Each structure stands twice: as C-alpha cells, then as structure tokens.
Design a binder for this molecule. Structure first.
Ligand SMILES: C[S@@+](CC[C@H](N)C(=O)[O-])C[C@H]1O[C@@H](n2cnc3c(N)ncnc32)[C@H](O)[C@@H]1O
Ligand SMILES: [K+]
Ligand SMILES: [Mg+2]
Ligand SMILES: [Mg+2]
Lengths: 360, 381
C-alpha cells in the first residue's frame, strides 16, 4: 500500500513562461493607470520575436517597448550568445485597444502535507527552479542560463484519505548552459549546490534516482529552441496533476474574468478549511446570476464531519459572488506579474493564500 | 454515496482556439504524407485577419504552407468578410525553423526505432469509465456530439444558415455507486452557434431543440425540468478570429476528459509521435480503456512521466476509485506485464506515423470509433 506521483515546473526563462510574464506585465501596466481596465492579452515568442495580440478596454496609454524589453531584461536574456536579447529583439504589437465611453466550473485544492498546503511534488519542483535563478543571478554558477525545467517524483502512502510523503524517488533537472563548463561539473553542481540545498535531507536516500542534464547538451535554448505561448503551463500554474482543473488559463486576463478570480477564491476556501482543522485534504468545486449554481466539497474521508456539514460552514463564512470576491481579495491592484512564475498557489505573497478564520 | 452536479464544455471548429489546433495538425499531416519520420512542432496563432505559424520542423517533405493553411480555413467554413474571416484574403505569416541540433543528438540521432528517447520531460494521464459504451464521461460525450451535429447539418445543407463558430455546455446529475458514477438525468444544456444575418432567433431555437438536441441526447435523460439555454446571448452573426485571439493548445480539457480524471499539461496539436505529450497520453488512454473493458474495474486513472532523452518511463501509477476486487498495486503489475510504454514501441502499436491527425483536432481526441487507442487490448493475467 504505497504509490508514486509526479509534477513538473519551469524556470523564468522557459519560453511559455516568458509569455505568461509579459502577458501579466501588460495587465499590471494598464491597471497602474486605470483600475477598471479590461484586458485579454496573448503573447507569442520565437527566435528574435515577441508578439502581442488580443483586446483591451482601458483609459491607459502604455509603452509596450519598455514593458516587453524591461521584462526580458529581468528574466536575463541580454546577448545573442544566449539566444535572445532585450536590446535587439523585434516587438510586434497587434492588440486592439478601445476607450470606455461567463460561466463555468472551477476547482480549489489543499493538502496538509506541507506548510504551503500544496503537494510536495510541485512545491519542490518550483523551489528548485527558484534556486537555479538565485545562484545564476548572485554569481555562484555563472555558466547557468535562464531556460530551465524540473520534475519530482515522490513515493507516498495513504492514511484515511490523507497522503503522507515517504521519500523522493526521482528528480529531473534540465538547464540551459554556457559553452565553457563540462558535463561532470554541471551534474555535480546540480546535486550538491541546488538539490541538497532545497530538498529536506529526510526525503533523500542512497536509492533516489537523478536525471541531471539528461539530454547531454543544452546550449541552444529559450524561444530559439522552442516556441512559447501564453497559457500553455496551466498545470504548472495550479496543482501539478493533483485535484482538478476546469480549463481556463490565468495570465493576461483581468479580474472580471471568472476563470482567474473565482479560481483564486476556490483555492482560498480550500486552504481555509484545512488550516481551520476541519479536514486534512480537500477538493472544492464551484458551479456557476452572481450567486454560484452549486457547490460540492470532496474531503477524501479526512473529516469527522459530513460533506453537508462543511458546505454549511462554507456558506455561513464566504460570499463567492465575483463582485464581492474582487473586493475582499483586493484584485484591482497591479500584482499579477509576481504570479506568472513559480505557481499561482502556495506562496505567502497573495491574498487568496491567507487563510480565513471560520466562525461556526 | 449521494447525488451531485458536473458540467463539461465543448467548442466548434470555428472557435478561435480550435482553428489553431486544426491548422497545426493539418501542417503535421502535410509533412507525414511525404516523410513518416518528420519531426514537427507547429504552433498556430489566430486573430483579426491573420493566421501565424511559429515553431520547429525537421522534414525531408516539401510543403506549400499558404495552400495548407488557406485550404483548412476554407474547410472550416470561412470564405467571406461577412462571416468575420476569408481564406482568400487573410494574412498568412510563417516563422518555422529547423529543430535544435542539441535536442536531436539527445533524443533520436544514432539510435534504434525502439530506443529513441522521449522528446521532452513531463507527466500525462489516462482515464476511463463504464458510464458509456464510449468509456467516456457523459457530460463531455454529449457536449462534443452536439458540436459535431451542428457542423454536420451546416455542411450537408440541412440547416444552411449555420456558421462555423460555437460553444456548448452540458450539466448532468449523478449518484455514486461504490466509487463508480451513474448518470441519471441531464440538468442543463447551453448552445451558442454563429449564424447567417437572415434568420430569426425563435425559429433557430426550435431547430436547435428539435434537429440537434433531440437527435443527440437519448430521451431517457430529458424531462420536464431540464433547463434549455438556446442562443442565450442573442444574435451571433460575426465569429471566429474577428475581434478575438486564439492559440494552439488552449482547449486541452475540451480535448480530453471535460474536467474529469486529471491533466498533466501537454497539448496535442502540431506534434509528431516523439512528443510524449501526444504519444504517451494516447497510450495511457489505451491502458485505461483496456482495464475497464477487460472487466478489471469500473473507473480508472493512470499516470506516466518521462525525461528528455530517456526511452523508459520514470513512473507509473494506477488509481481505481475503489471500483475493483484487486488492489491498485496488483493492477500496476498487470499493466507492466501487458504494455511497453517506450515511445519507439507505442508508435508501432498505435501506428502513429500515419497522417490521421487533423481528424483529432475537433470533437475530442478520445471516445472515437476508428482511432487505434480506442481498440482495447485483450489482457493476460
Ligand atoms: C525540448 S522542447 C520540446 C519541443 C521542441 N520545440 C522540439 O522542436 O522538439 C521544450 C522545452 O525543453 C527544454 N529544452 C530545450 N532544449 C533542450 C535541450 N537541448 N535539452 C533539454 N531540454 C531542453 C526547453 O526549456 C524547452 O522549452
Ligand atoms: K512549443
Ligand atoms: Mg510550449
Ligand atoms: Mg510540459
């Protein structure tokens, strides 16, 4: 009675994530000037090209040059030797901006297996990419480049529906590098200076499988290696394969799109229930008229209470009308670029990650 | 054990996201018809008056991209500016390069058919369920089949005022049974479809209920209380790309299990078999259907995972929702004796170098009659 489970994550310089950041950077630029701006911005990236397409209703007037190039500068693509460069890339704008003059099924999920209230597979996957970026920027590993991917397999057991992480079974890391460092040195660095500094020692053992630079070469990367598009990392963005997904992407959409804000809300509910002591693992499902059509709470058997009883607690403590959601969570503020890498869930930076006290 | 509600969505060929998925695979088919070993990774972008291709291709084939793209827009049904898009007069822009030499040395160069490494890392899921002969959730089968009937009646002349863009949503009421799910009745149906200027809504809502819903949803799930939302936002004369943006790989829940099971995040369209995103998801579906159709369980989830350059899987997991005599560990062992989930062997069993892929790009990749991953394998145990 044990099982395995896997999740991936992706660095700031991954081509799909580059577009998620540019998309949310534009949303922030518009909101900074017009709190009621309406945005649906798609980004596309390939060798030498950043392209902006979509619709916007907004009083603002945005410098898309400074917006795109500053973000590419932050990510770290600044020379042709790296495959991309913010000073010399082509910035094409096909957006349609006007002056002012949906429904769905969304999911929330939470698990008491970590402080982040998130599956250990994805938490670890995210943190490894953050560590790569941190050692690249501070000088510790100057051969590292911005494009990276990680994935983590954990061996678990059950206990009345809750999941208990036993060991890390397999870790993958592929990362774009410069032309001077050799293969042995890279695999050594990845294990000793990145993995061992990120994964708690209790999860590591002599049996753990390492696939470090498995392709054997990764000089060509970024958009030159692989075309990038907004909203192509929706599982990296959310629960790593756990829980569920209704199917909408987050980046480049404003708060009036229920796909984003109601999804955040459902995470908020799920995290509140677990941290409130009511269950150890939970799925929240909101069906969508401003009041939601239906709500069901699946606790996997980890609550003394019944599922009817939890619904009652939820209804007595929360108002999930998109209008009210937007007020309580403060979603008109320009804080969206921060969400676009390392996951929108399980970071102690955002309003929907602060649990609510439940009076019942 | 107690009833609940679930909804799935589907979209028509003329929805801007699905346009991109279809073009991507039409480009893949063009290449495979000439070179079965072509490596293709084609992304499509769609917006007011433009189709753009961006991505990577290594192929011995010669392809006329303008011809391939415009033919598919015609096939979809956009031939005039009054519909919001015209294949004769749109802008087609091409940014397609060779695949990275770094990738190729790591994956395929100097290796056997069976021993080619995975094209990328990632995770993927298979799902199946005895609630239909299709072995698919009823919510998503119905939503897809509604969009199929719409395109059928539009194309053959039965309702010639219909246009290419549409969205459907189907809500079903369910009860549990020892972990399995039992579809009882349909609670809500929602349909918007693009139409010609010259038709009235009243008449249109009537054809939708009578020629479309009634001919697709078995009568047993239809009752006095079933809520119908037909053309709920009124007239819908202009559709597709016009005033809208769309991308390849943006309808990945629609493409698969309509909210049910799980997803790993890999898009299907525009990718040849060496992308495990496609090949391994197709195989996972094959496994899951075989386990259910073999009588070994009533509902099942299957996970796999890969690392770039490595042929073998990094992990395999089976979840039966409590619907089996045998344990989950017992079911894993049966899978391991019966299947070889190396991509260089999946290609052979499912025949994945054949140019069949434009068919998969609307109305779901699963629950389809003729696709190889839907013919269940007889299992030895
Ligand atoms: C490997 S590619 C897959 C598809 C690719 N476009 C193709 O033409 O085959 C996707 C991701 O893998 C990572 N990657 C790119 N080149 C790589 C290499 N040589 N080795 C390992 N990973 C790589 C990048 O982060 C990239 O975003
Ligand atoms: K890509
Ligand atoms: Mg991608
Ligand atoms: Mg992926």
């Amino acid at each position: 009675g044990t099982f395995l489970f896997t999740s991936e994550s992706v660095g700031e310089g991954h081509p799909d994530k580059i577009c998620d950041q540019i998309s949310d950077a534009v949303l922030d630029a518009h909101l900074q000037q017009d709190p009621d701006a309406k945005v649906a911005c798609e980004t596309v990236a390939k060798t030498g090209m950043i392209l902006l397409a979509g619709e916007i209703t907004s009083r603002a007037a945005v410098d898309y040059q400074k917006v795109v190039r500053e973000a590419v500068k932050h990510i770290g693509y600044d020379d042709s030797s790296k495959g991309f460069d913010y000073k010399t890339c082509n910035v094409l704008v096909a957006l349609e901006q006007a002056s002012p003059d949906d429904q769905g099924l969304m999911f929330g999920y939470a698990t008491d297996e970590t402080e982040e209230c998130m599956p250990l597979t994805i938490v670890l996957a995210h943190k490894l990419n953050a560590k790569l970026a941190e050692l690249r920027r501070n000088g510790t590993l100057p051969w590292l480049r911005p494009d990276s991917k990680t994935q983590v397999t954990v061996q678990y057991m059950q206990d009345r529906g809750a999941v208990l992480p036993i060991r890390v079974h397999t870790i993958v890391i592929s990362v774009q590098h410069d032309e001077e460092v050799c293969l042995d040195e890279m695999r050594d660095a990845l294990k000793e200076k990145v993995i061992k500094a990120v994964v708690p020692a209790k999860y590591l053992d002599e049996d753990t499988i390492y696939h470090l630079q498995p392709s054997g070469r990764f000089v060509i990367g970024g958009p030159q290696g692989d075309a990038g598009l907004t909203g192509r990392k929706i599982i990296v963005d959310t629960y790593g394969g756990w829980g569920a997904h209704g199917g909408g992407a987050f980046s480049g959409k404003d708060y009036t799109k229920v796909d984003r804000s109601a999804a955040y809300a459902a995470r908020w509910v799920a995290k509140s229930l677990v941290k409130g002591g009511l269950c150890r693992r939970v799925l929240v499902q909101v069906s969508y008229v401003s009041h939601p059509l239906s709500i069901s709470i699946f606790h996997y058997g980890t609550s003394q209470k019944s599922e009817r009883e939890l619904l009652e607690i939820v209804k007595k403590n929360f108002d999930l009308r998109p209008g009210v959601i937007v007020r309580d969570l403060d979603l008109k503020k320009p804080i969206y670029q921060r969400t676009a890498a390392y996951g929108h869930f399980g970071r102690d930076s955002f309003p929907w990650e602060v649990p609510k006290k439940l009076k019942y």
